[PDB]
Design a protein. Structure first.
Length: 138
């Protein structure tokens, strides 16, 4: 056996729900997706991008930031707040975000001022990597 049913969503959302050989999580801390036998866990999935391979499908990559998870015997499922997928309508208009976020990482206003913004920067460009590889899709 090498497939299971997964269901990732973020409040009224339908990113991936159906058969699934394995997904993929890429965040600062964590580098595994999901498979038929990932033990009964239920913590967070960390931010970053995500890749997957449907049992009868080819492969797709979504993208999240913060959320919890819950796997069951035969199908996993998790919930999150922001869930964007390689696309988000606009594409090159998001590249200017990493530039407007610098003015914040360059301004000092405390020990955790822009320092805490560094986590919202490296996690925002996570959706730019999966969306940049969608140029060869069409």
């Amino acid at each position: 056996a090498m497939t299971y049913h997964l269901d990732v969503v973020s409040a009224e959302q339908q990113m991936f729900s159906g058969l699934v050989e394995k997904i993929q999580v890429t965040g600062s801390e964590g580098e595994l997706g999901i498979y038929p036998g990932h033990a009964p866990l239920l913590t967070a999935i960390k931010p970053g991008m995500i890749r997957i391979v449907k049992q009868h499908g080819h492969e797709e990559f979504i993208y999240l930031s913060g959320g919890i998870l819950e796997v069951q015997p035969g199908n996993v499922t998790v919930l999150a707040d922001t869930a964007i997928r390689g696309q988000d309508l606009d594409e090159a208009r998001a590249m200017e975000a990493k530039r407007k976020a610098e003015e914040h990482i360059s301004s000092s206003h405390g020990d955790v001022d822009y320092a805490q913004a560094s986590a919202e920067l490296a996690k925002a460009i996570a959706q730019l990597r999966v969306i940049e590889l969608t140029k060869k899709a069409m």
